Amino acid sequence: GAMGSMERASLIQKAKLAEQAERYEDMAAFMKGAVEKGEELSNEERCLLSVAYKNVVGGQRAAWRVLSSIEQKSNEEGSEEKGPEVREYREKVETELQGVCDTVLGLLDSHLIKEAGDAESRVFYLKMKGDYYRYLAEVATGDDKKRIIDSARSAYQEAMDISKKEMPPTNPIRLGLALNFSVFHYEIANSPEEAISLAKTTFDEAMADLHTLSEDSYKDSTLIMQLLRDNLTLWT
Amino acid sequence: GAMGSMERASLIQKAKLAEQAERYEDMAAFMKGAVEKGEELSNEERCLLSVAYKNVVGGQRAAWRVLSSIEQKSNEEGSEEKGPEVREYREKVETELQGVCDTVLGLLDSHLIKEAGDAESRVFYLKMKGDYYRYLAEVATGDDKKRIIDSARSAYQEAMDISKKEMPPTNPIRLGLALNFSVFHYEIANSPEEAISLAKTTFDEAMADLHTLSEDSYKDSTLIMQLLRDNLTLWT
Amino acid sequence: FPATV
Amino acid sequence: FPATV
Ligand SMILES: *SCCNC(=O)C(C)(C)Oc1ccc(Br)c(OC)c1
Ligand SMILES: *SCCNC(=O)C(C)(C)Oc1ccc(Br)c(OC)c1
Ligand SMILES: [Mg+2]
Ligand SMILES: [Mg+2]
Ligand SMILES: [Mg+2]
Ligand SMILES: [Mg+2]
Ligand SMILES: [Mg+2]
Ligand SMILES: [Mg+2]
């Protein structure tokens, strides 16, 4: 690790600076170094890790979609042949994206998940595992595609089972997990009815529990509930 | 060069793809590879080179400014000591920025400027040379700062002298050079009166030549004239 | 695209 | 910041 010589606390401090400067690649590298110190992460530190990689891979996904669309148009009838360059460059971006996903999955497997015993940590890491397998599935076209999809499903499912047993229905991590697993069903698994059912039941069961919350918790939960509603509106 | 094995035309094609995907680091790497083929660049290719590096260094400058502001606040009275991390990370971003500027300046010196004989190429490369020395000056605090400032000044001045002799006053490259040299005077050289004079005279001499232009050229020239006006409004 | 967090 | 191109 190039971060092996930097103090854990300094890595965390610099991750926060990198976030302020919108330097998400640096942020991710600092958080990878922090994870590799071997200690468990606090709630705030788990948020830093997830924000850094979500922004890095989100930019890669957006670029991959632009290039994939150009590549599809180049393969339509009446399109002038332009050579291998579009495919090559799409492949370059795809391979980088896969590398980032493999890095995150590697941190989760070595050894964040196995030491995560509380629901708030374990559900969040298993949600991340589902997310990064989902990003791998978005670009998969080969003989492991079904296994990649199933890996995402299995991680999400374990997170769901824990979240339903151990968290209230308004817990933001439970809500965000459900939001993303619902998207998995709709976009990856060819299961729009499951996606819709999950989003609706999650939203309704959260609504019924809002009365138990403080004003600040209510704000946190309703924010994610609105995302579930936005997806339901998109899908119906 | 990692791009040494890729065809020039393929590098240009991929630079255009990278621009569409907003992958400016890749764009810059592809254009560096294209320059290193040793052939002169067309007008479109000079635009690709400048767009790629302007976006890379522009992001570095924005991040450096965020970090420098945090570092200044940390050095005020009543600020709790936070250790060397802010300075270290500002220095990391600064060193990367300097590296990009040195790379661009190196391409200009080896050998874009010396083979550029037409005004449209030579003025544009000398403007770039001024710009990248200006970016080095923004972060300079040491014993070479005056020489760095003078290097920017000298490049801008040579570009100005050529532009006034060889281009009409509405030429967009002449206008953009004047815009940036005016900013150099205001922000780098502690010469706001020179900055204002240059912007005003450039704007007025362009106005008087608009009557000679087609509708499309008029659009191109008035776009940059409005930037000169925006700066004049900021400064007066 | 749909919303994810 | 002022405008540059
Ligand atoms: S962890 C980063 C801080 N949180 C957030 O940015 C928002 C979207 C406000 O909250 C949530 C809520 C639930 C989840 Br699972 C996440 O995951 C990143 C974020
Ligand atoms: S070279 C990139 C294409 N041009 C532009 O983006 C705009 C700003 C429209 O035009 C100009 C005009 C004059 C100059 Br010197 C530049 O330099 C990049 C750009
Ligand atoms: Mg230590
Ligand atoms: Mg591939
Ligand atoms: Mg169920
Ligand atoms: Mg060749
Ligand atoms: Mg320095
Ligand atoms: Mg003069």
Greatest extent of chain B over all pairs of C-alpha atoms, in Å: 62
Give the closest-approach CA distance of A202 to chain B in angstroms: 36
Nearest to B67, CA basis, from B82, B52, B77, B46: B82
Nearest CA to ligand 1 atom 18: C5
**D contact test, residue of B64, B180, B202 with most D CBs within 10 A:** B180
The DSSP letter of residue B109 is I
In angstroms, the CA B204 to CA A54 distance is 49
Ligand nearest to the CA of B33: 6
The alpha carbon of residue A226 and the mean position of all alpha carbons in its chain are separated, in whole angstroms, by 18
Phi, psi (deg, nearest 5) at residue B197 = -55, -50
The encoded tokens of residue A48 equal 């830093």
State which ligand 2 atom lies nearest to the alpha carbon of B46.
1
* CB of residue C5 inside a 6 A radius of ligand 1: yes
Peptide bond into B185 cis (omega under 30): no
A26-31, long-range: CB within 8 Å, 24+ apart, which pairs?
Answer: A26/B89, A26/B92, A27/A51, A27/A52, A27/A55, A28/A52, A28/A53, A28/A55, A28/A56, A28/A100, A29/A2, A29/A3, A30/A3
Instruction: Give me the long-range contacts of B66-73 (CB less than 8 A, separation at least 24).
Output: B66/A20, B66/A21, B66/A22, B67/A17, B67/A21, B67/B93, B70/A17, B70/A20
CA-CA distance, B150 to B233, in Å (whole number)?
A: 27
Contact B235 D3 (CB under 8 A): no
Q: How far is CA A148 from the centre of its chain?
A: 15
**Chains B and D: how many Cβ contacts under 8 Å?**
21
Q: Which residues contact B75 (CB under 8 A, 6 or more apart)?
A: none
Token pair of A79, please? 């399109």
HEC sequence for B89-116? HHHHHHHHHHHHHHHHHHHHHHHHHHHC
Is A35 within 8 Å of A110 (Cβ atoms)? no
Query: For residue A142, which phi and psi values (nearest 5 degrees)?
Result: -105, -160
Numbers of helices and strands, H then E, in chain A: 10, 0
CB B126 within 8 A of CB B155: yes
The answer, for A63 touching chain B at a CB cutoff of 8 Å, is yes
* Closest ligand by atom to A205 CA: 5
List of chains touching D (3+ CB pairs within 8 A): B
Residue with tokens 């008035």: B222
Expt. technique: X-ray
Examine chains B and C and say if they touch (3+ CB pairs below 8 A): no
D1 CA to chain B: closest CA distance, Å? Answer: 9
Residues A181, A182, A183, A188, CA torsion sign: positive
A173 lines ligand 1 (CB under 6 A): yes
CA distance B10 to B14: 6
Instruction: State the distance from the centre of ligand 3 to the C-alpha of B47, rounded, in angstroms.
Output: 48
Q: How far apart are CA B118 and CA B165, in angstroms?
A: 12
Resolution to one decimal, Å: 1.1
Beta strands in chain B (DSSP E): none
Domains contained in chain A, CATH given: 8-235 (1.20.190.20)
Which of B182, B198, B176 lies closest to B125 in space, CA to CA? B176
Task: State the Rg of chain A over Cα.
Answer: 19
Contact between residue A82 and residue B13 where contact means Cβ atoms under 8 Å apart: yes
Task: Count CA atoms closer than 13 A to B120's CA, side-chain side.
Answer: 12
Q: Is A176 in the pocket of ligand 1 (CB under 6 A)?
A: yes
Q: Which residue has the tokens 């308004």?
A: A170
Which chains does A contact via 3+ CB–CB distances below 8 A? B, C
Q: From the centroid of its chain, how far is CA B151?
A: 14
Distances (CA, A) of A191 to A126, A164, B93: 21, 21, 45
Distance B8 CA to ligand 6 centre (A): 6
Candidates A103, A149, A160, A150; CA nearest to A126 is: A160
Distance CA B113, CA B235 (A): 33
Q: Scan for tokens 């990009």, then name that residue.
A: B100
Three-state DSSP string of A179-205: HHHHHHHHHHCCCHHHHHHHHHHHHHH
User: C4–A180: do the CB atoms touch at under 8 Å?
Assistant: yes
Angle between helices B43-74 and B24-35 (to 10 degrees): 130
Measured in angstroms, how far is the CA atom of residue B94 from the centroid of ligand 7?
A: 6
Q: At what angle do helices B119-139 and B172-183 cross, to 10 degrees?
A: 20
Q: How far apart are CA B216 and CA B55, in angstroms?
A: 26
